[PDB]
């Protein structure tokens, strides 16, 4: 068995600009240490099928790109949720087949209302479903 | 199978949860190990390891959902609304040992009135 799984929350509240990687600095779980909390990037060392998910607290317009790739990162999907002024939680999820060295991370856009507070968490999680060979 | 663990439970009651109270999901969809107890509202770990917990809670006023682990608040997600129905969702991966307890709770924002056809669900499963 390969146990690869991470859950990480964001506790810094510096404003995100466009195309910045969204860092989840605080590690709840990081089994096999394939999530990098200094960056916010998961890096695949064991190729196979993975599920990635997040829940982001927000007070305004939030759009985030889910990014994937080895060399140049590419957008898989964009998730958008438009709060007007008020506290909300939004979610996105995806099953990805990953090769070795593929990075997976969330990327900021111009709609950057994402907060990390004790009473309104933002969390990024992922786990291996089935390894390869 | 006794060496696995999976549940999905729902909440069917007109009684709203009290502020700061544990949310009891009183109706089973799947629970073959009995790991969630629908009369106490608590998961209790039988098989140790890494679990994924996730919920989706319907509400028409302000709701914060808290995940607790043996009396310590793990995560909190909040959703504000005044009349319209929305879904509050949250989730977390936790490594658990035998006898550890997991439940969901509300804080001072406690509403769980969905419109008809909008439900509230809590799920968990052992991953490895």
């Amino acid at each position, epitope marked *: 068995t390969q146990k690869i799984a991470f859950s990480a929350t964001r*506790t810094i509240n510096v404003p995100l600009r466009r195309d910045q990687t969204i860092r*989840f600095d605080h*590690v*709840i779980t990081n089994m096999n*240490n394939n999530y990098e909390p200094r960056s916010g990037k998961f890096t695949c060392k064991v190729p196979g099928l993975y599920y990635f998910t997040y829940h982001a607290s927000s007070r305004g317009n939030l759009c985030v790109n889910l990014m994937r790739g080895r060399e140049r990162a590419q957008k898989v999907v964009t998730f958008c949720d438009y709060a007007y002024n008020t506290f909300q939680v939004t979610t996105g999820g995806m099953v990805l087949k990953l090769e070795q060295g593929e990075n997976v991370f969330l990327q900021a856009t111009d709609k950057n209302s994402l907060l990390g507070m004790e009473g309104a968490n933002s969390i990024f999680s992922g786990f291996l479903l089935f390894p390869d060979m | 199978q006794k060496f696995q663990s999976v549940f999905t439970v729902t909440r069917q009651t007109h009684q709203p949860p009290a502020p700061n109270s544990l949310i009891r999901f009183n109706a089973v969809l799947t629970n073959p190990q009995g790991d969630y107890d629908t009369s106490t509202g608590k998961f209790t770990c039988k098989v140790p390891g890494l679990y994924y917990f996730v919920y989706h809670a319907s509400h028409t006023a302000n709701l914060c959902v808290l995940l607790y682990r043996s009396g310590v*608040k793990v*995560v909190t997600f909040c959703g504000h609304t005044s009349k319209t129905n929305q879904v509050n969702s949250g989730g977390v991966l936790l490594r658990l040992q035998v006898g550890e307890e997991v439940w969901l709770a509300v804080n001072d924002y406690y509403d769980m009135v969905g419109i008809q056809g909008s439900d509230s669900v809590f799920s968990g499963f052992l991953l490895f």
Partner: nanobody
Amino acid sequence: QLVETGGGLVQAGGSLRLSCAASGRTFNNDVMAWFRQAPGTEREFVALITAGGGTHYADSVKGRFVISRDNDKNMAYLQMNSLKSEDTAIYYCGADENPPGWPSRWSSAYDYWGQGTQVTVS
């Protein structure tokens, strides 16, 4: 094991850098915290840093202390400025391998400690 170093005698208004060296396992997935104990009162929280570098400070040290860490070298640091006689204490470094989604300021959350280092201010 954690080992605190860097303490000693400082004149008030001065600066001091403490170091906490970790060993046994990698601590890159742990919360690191500094606690302090002056004689006569209890172990008060000073500062903490998450795995990825997120810093959180007590109100008494905000604007004066900087907590940092180096995941490649298994090190955590407390850079202290504008030192006052109230900062005289034994300083303790602690690690939490199993935090909740927000890092704790309670000393009972920190599963390993070191032999503290003594800071004496003027």
